[PDB]
């Protein structure tokens with residue numbers, strides 16, 4: 271399976287910076303969603319789930335085809351709650367009918383991270399929508415009730431190494447788990463929407479307690495109101511993972527640079543870019559534009 275990137279006809283950087291600004295401006299406007307967390311967290315979760323279906327062995331899945339618009343993927347139990355991100359983007363797609371689905375879902379992810387003051391993420395255009403029979407089957411996304419060995423083996427399918435996996439998991443500093451979507455609950459009081467290296471600092475400094483929640487699932491809870499999934503807590507149980515957790519807890523600039531590389535790689539897996547293709551775009555934030 272080869273997927274060649276194809277620039278939307280006649281478009282250039284100025285066109286995609288307008289779509290970036292439309293997403294960022296609506297993120298500012300609809301600030302009340304999910305008890306004032308806003309839509310930033312669910313949009314980086316959507317971009318990860320539409321990319322996280324990729325399989326390096328036969329190049330099926332991934333962000334290229336925009337197949338989340340089809341029923342089988344939209345109704346995957348693992349994607350419960352992401353309908354809210356899709357409904358957020360649906361007016362922006364109406365406004366810019368020329369951008370492909372895969373490009374709009376991955377650009378929503380990039381825009382959310384930068385507007386929540388995370389690192390710049392270089393982004394490349396050219397994903398092309400493919401037919402409903404190219405939709406991957408359900409069951410390619412990870413379970414949350416497992417250990418370090420499972421996380422490592424799972425991420426090898428997307429060929430992510432240990433360092434890339436620990437950098438990517440730092441996004442669980444954002445937003446919250448919801449009992450009706452996944453069977454995990456919390457945080458609430460201090461759930462957030464600013465991108466920082468706080469997930470690593472919390473993992474190493476909080477006093478964690480293994481408790482059972484209202485859906486009868488176990489999770490790690492702290493006195494301060496924070497929570498961790500079994501798969502999050504895994505990162506301090508494994509010796510390789512723990513030494514990288516300690517490095518990002520002690521250097522937020524190294525965490526930003528490594529997250530940026532790994533998130534762009536996640537969004538680009540499975541796509542072949544021609545050498546006459548444009549360079550990656552670095553979009554300005556609303557703040558850098560004075561908007």
Ligand code: HEM
Pocket residue numbers: 311312314315318350351412413414421438439441442444445446447448449451452453454499501
């Ligand atoms: C083994 C890996 C992972 C597992 C098992 C996992 C699992 C989960 C679960 C169970 C939720 C809660 C969903 C809900 O109830 O609403 C969640 C939320 C979230 N995840 Fe992950 N995740 C993984 C990796 C990642 C990665 C790699 C990213 C991003 C690069 C990410 C970003 C997010 C974000 C931002 C949320 C919050 C969504 C919201 O606030 O609505 N996750 N994760």
Ligand SMILES: c1ccc2[nH]cnc2c1
Pocket residue numbers: 442443444445446447456457497498499502
């Ligand atoms: C999603 C959101 C917040 C989290 N804190 C720990 N794991 C999480 C997953």
